[PDB]
C-alpha cells in the first residue's frame, strides 16, 4: 500500500557465518597453583560463574565440521603455546658429541614385584659416557648417562653412538617447573559474535541441525594429545557415532566416538634417579643417573571384557555403512613410531604403547554368541625422551626423567581408524580397519564438532505504517 | 563400493570428427589420456573441469550415472588410450585409430 514506510529495528535476532578471534577462559579453581602449566596459562580470563545456554526453538542451522575454522585456530594456539614455553629453557647443543655406550649393569633383587612378567628395562637402555664442558669453557669433564635405545642411533665404529636429533635440529630441555597437565580451555567470542551449538544426540559432522542452541563459550576442552585413541574426552550422548568426511574415500580418517568410557591404566614400574651435571655457564642437564629397585617394562592395563563389548558395538555401527561385508581390525601397517604405537603423556613421561591385542580380530557374521571369562590385557609400552610431536613443525624437546614410580588412569573416548582400499580381494566380503591416522587436528574435531561461530546483525529494515513526524 | 564400466572398448573414428566415449561411475570421475608406454596425463577432473594446459578441444559433461568425453576437431596427435578414473578403480580404457 501507499501507507508503508521504511522502519529501522535495532536488536534484531539475525546472524551470518563468520570467522573471528576466540580468546581463552579458564576456571580459577584450577588456577593459583603456581605450577606454570603450558596450555591454559595465567593469561586466560576467569570463566563465567553462570554460563548461559539459550535454546532456540524453531531454528534449523547447517553445521559442517571438516571445514570449521575453530579447529584451525586451536591448532595455531596449541603449537604457539608449546614453542613459547620452551623458549627460556636450556639448549642441549653440547650433548651432540660422540657417545660410547655399553650394556647397563644394576644391583637389586626385586622379583618382579607383581604379576606381570613383560620383561625388564635391561636391553632397552644403554650406559653411555661422553665428554662435556665444565662451567669453564677450556675444561672438559667425562660424564655418563642412561639413554633409551630409541634416543640414540649408532653412526659407525660399533659401541659409538649419537643422539637422533643431532642431524635434524637442536632440542631444548623442558624446564623443571613447567607442567604438562592438560586443564580445560573455554573458547569465547567477542561481543557481537556468538557460538551456535548442535544439541542433536545422533548427529554426524555435516547437515542441518534441528536443535540449535546459543552459547558464548565452548565447554572445557582439554588439549590432551594422543595418536590412536582419544583420551579424557567427552562421551557421546545418544550412541556410538562414526564420523568421516567421506566414508567412500579411504584417504580420510574415520573418527569413532564412544558412548561408554573404557578405562586404560598405565604405569612405569621402574625407579629412575634424576641427577644433574653442568654442561655450560648457567646450563644444567638432567639425566637418569641410575635405575635401582624395581626394573620392569612399562605397561598399560585394559579390562578385556569391556574392550570386547566396546569393540563389538562399534562393528555394529560399521556394518550399517558397510552392509554385506565382514569387518576386521588389524595393527598399523607402518609409518613413524607415533603412528604405529599409542603415544600419550603422563606426568611429563612420554609413552608409546603397542596396542596390537586391541586391534587384532575378525567379525565374520556373528552367527553365534561366543563367551569368555574376564581377562586383563597388558600392553607393553616404551618411554622416549627426545620428543617431536608436531611432525617436525614445532620445537624439539627433551623430557627430564621423573623421580619415582609413575601411574596414570585415563578414559578412552574414541578411536581413529583408517580403512584400506582395494579392487577385487578387498571386495570379497571383508573390510580391514587399522588404528591411527589423520593428524592432531582430528584430536580436536572430536570436541569442536558441535560448534559454529557466527556474527550478529542487529539492524533490521521492515515496512510499517509509522511515518516520522516532520516539524 | 564403486561401480563403473566403459562400454566402448575400441572405435575407429576418422580424422576431424567429434567422438564421445561414455563411462558410468558411482563417484568422482577424472579423464586421463595415455600414449604407448607413457605416463598418463590429466585432461578433465570431476567430469567437467578443464585442466590448466590442455587445449579447449577436450571437454566432458555429466548427467546421472554417465559421463561423456568429447574430442571435437580430432588431430593426428590426439591418438592415445583414454581413462575414466575413480578413487582407486580404473578400467582398461579405449584406444583410438584412423
Amino acid at each position: 500500500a501507499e501507507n508503508l514506510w521504511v522502519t529501522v529495528y535495532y536488536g534484531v535476532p539475525v546472524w551470518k557465518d563468520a570467522d573471528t578471534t576466540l580468546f581463552c577462559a579458564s576456571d580459577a579453581k584450577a588456577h593459583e597453583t603456581e605450577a606454570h602449566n603450558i596450555w591454559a596459562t595465567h593469561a586466560c580470563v576467569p570463566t563465567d560463574p553462570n554460563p548461559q545456554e539459550i535454546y532456540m526453538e524453531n531454528v534449523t542451522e547447517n553445521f559442517n565440521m571438516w571445514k570449521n575454522n575453530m579447529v584451525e585456530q586451536m591448532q595455531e594456539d596449541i603449537i604457539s603455546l608449546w614453542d613459547q614455553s620452551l623458549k627460556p629453557c636450556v639448549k642441549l647443543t653440547p650433548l651432540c658429541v660422540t657417545l660410547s655406550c655399553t650394556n647397563v649393569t644394576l644391583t637389586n633383587v626385586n622379583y618382579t614385584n607383581n604379576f606381570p612378567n613383560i620383561g625388564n628395562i635391561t636391553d632397552e637402555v644403554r650406559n653411555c659416557s661422553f665428554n662435556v664442558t665444565t662451567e669453564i669453557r677450556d675444561k672438559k669433564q667425562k660424564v655418563y648417562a642412561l639413554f633409551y635405545k630409541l634416543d640414540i642411533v649408532q653412526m659407525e665404529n660399533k659401541n659409538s653412538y649419537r643422539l637422533i636429533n643431532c642431524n635434524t635440529s637442536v632440542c631444548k630441555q623442558a624446564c623443571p617447573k613447567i607442567s604438562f597437565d592438560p586443564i580445560p580451555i573455554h573458547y569465547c567470542t567477542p561481543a557481537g559474535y556468538a557460538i551456535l551449538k548442535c544439541n542433536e544426540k545422533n548427529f554426524n559432522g555435516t547437515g542441518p541441525c534441528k536443535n540449535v542452541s546459543s552459547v558464548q563459550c565452548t565447554h572445557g576442552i582439554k588439549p590432551v594429545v594422543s595418536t590412536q585413541l582419544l583420551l579424557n574426552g567427552s562421551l557421546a550422548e545418544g550412541e556410538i557415532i562414526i564420523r568421516s568426511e567421506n566414508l567412500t574415500n579411504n584417504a580420510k580418517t574415520i573418527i569413532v566416538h564412544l558412548n561408554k568410557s573404557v578405562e586404560i591404566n598405565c604405569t612405569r614400574p621402574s625407579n629412575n634417579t634424576r641427577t644433574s651435571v653442568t654442561i655450560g655457564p648457567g646450563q644444567v642437564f638432567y639425566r637418569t643417573g641410575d635405575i635401582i629397585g624395581d626394573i620392569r617394562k612399562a605397561y598399560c592395563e585394559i579390562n578385556g571384557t569391556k574392550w570386547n563389548e566396546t569393540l563389538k558395538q562399534v562393528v555394529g555401527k560399521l556394518k550399517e555403512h558397510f552392509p554385506n561385508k565382514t569387518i576386521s581390525f588389524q595393527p598399523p601397517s607402518g609409518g613413524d613410531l607415533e603412528i604405529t604405537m599409542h603415544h600419550f603423556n603422563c606426568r611429563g613421561e612420554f609413552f608409546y604403547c603397542n596396542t596390537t591385542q586391541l586391534f587384532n580380530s575378525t567379525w565374520i557374521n556373528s552367527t553365534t554368541i561366543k563367551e569368555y571369562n574376564d581377562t586383563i590385557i597388558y600392553l607393553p609400552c616404551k618411554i622416549k625422551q627426545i620428543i617431536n610431536m608436531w611432525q617436525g613443525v614445532g620445537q624439539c624437546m627433551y623430557a627430564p626423567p621423573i623421580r619415582g614410580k609413575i601411574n596414570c588412569v585415563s578414559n578412552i573416548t574414541g578411536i581413529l581408524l583408517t580403512r584400506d582400499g582395494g579392487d577385487a580381494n578387498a571386495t570379497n566380503d571383508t573390510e580391514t580397519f587399522r588404528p591411527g591416522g589423520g593428524n592432531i587436528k582430528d584430536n580436536w574435531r572430536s570436541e569442536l564438532y558441535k560448534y559454529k561461530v557466527v556474527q550478529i546483525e542487529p539492524l533490521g529494515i521492515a515496512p510499517t505504517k509509522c511515518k516520522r513526524r516532520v516539524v | 563400493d564403486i561401480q563403473m564400466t566403459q562400454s566402448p572398448s575400441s572405435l575407429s573414428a576418422s580424422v576431424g570428427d567429434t567422438v564421445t566415449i561414455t563411462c558410468q561411475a558411482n563417484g568422482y570421475l577424472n579423464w586421463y589420456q595415455q600414449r604407448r608406454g607413457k605416463a598418463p596425463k590429466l585432461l578433465i577432473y570431476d567430469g567437467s573441469k578443464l585442466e590448466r594446459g590442455v587445449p579447449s578441444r577436450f571437454s566432458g559433461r555429466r548427467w546421472g550415472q554417465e559421463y561423456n568425453l568429447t574430442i571435437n576437431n580430432l588431430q593426428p596427435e590426439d591418438i592415445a588410450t583414454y581413462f575414466c578414473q575413480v578413487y582407486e578403480f580404473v578400467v582398461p580404457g579405449t584406444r583410438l585409430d584412423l
Partner: nanobody, 121 residues
Framework: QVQLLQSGAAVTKPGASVRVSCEAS????????IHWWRQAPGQGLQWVGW????????????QFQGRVSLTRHASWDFDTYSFYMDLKALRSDDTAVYFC????????????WGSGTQVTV
C-alpha cells in the same frame, strides 16, 4: 615447476626384492599424498597404495599385504623427498611399469606422474 623423477629400469630374479625410487622436489611435498600405480604390459593401471608424506603411514590393498612396503625419506629442510617402493617376493606377475603419482585434491586428481620404471623378472 613440479617434477617426480624416477629411477632406471630394474631386472631381477624370482623371489628377490626390488627398490623403486621416486623423487619430488618442486612443491610442498608434505601436503599431498603420493600414490603408486602398477601397469602390467598390455593391461590397465592398478592401484598399489598411498603414503602420507607427513607421517609415512602407508595403505595398500589386500593383494599387496606383506609384500609392498612404502617408505619416504625427507631432506633436512624438506625441500626434496625420496619415496621408495619395495617388493619382497616376486613372481612373473610382477612384471610391470610402476608410477609414482601426486594426488592433488579430494577428487584424487593425479596431475603429476613419474616417467615410469620397468620392473621385469
Amino acid at each position: 615447476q613440479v617434477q617426480l623423477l624416477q629411477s632406471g629400469a630394474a631386472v631381477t630374479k624370482p623371489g628377490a626384492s626390488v627398490r623403486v625410487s621416486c623423487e619430488a622436489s618442486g612443491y610442498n611435498i608434505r601436503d599431498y599424498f603420493i600414490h603408486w600405480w602398477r601397469q602390467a604390459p598390455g593391461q590397465g593401471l592398478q592401484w598399489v597404495g598411498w603414503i602420507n608424506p607427513k607421517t609415512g603411514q602407508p595403505n595398500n590393498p589386500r593383494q599387496f599385504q606383506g609384500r609392498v612396503s612404502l617408505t619416504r625419506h625427507a631432506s633436512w629442510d624438506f625441500d626434496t623427498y625420496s619415496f621408495y617402493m619395495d617388493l619382497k617376493a616376486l613372481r612373473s606377475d610382477d612384471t610391470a611399469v610402476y608410477f609414482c603419482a601426486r594426488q592433488r585434491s579430494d577428487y584424487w586428481d593425479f596431475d603429476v606422474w613419474g616417467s615410469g620404471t620397468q620392473v621385469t623378472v
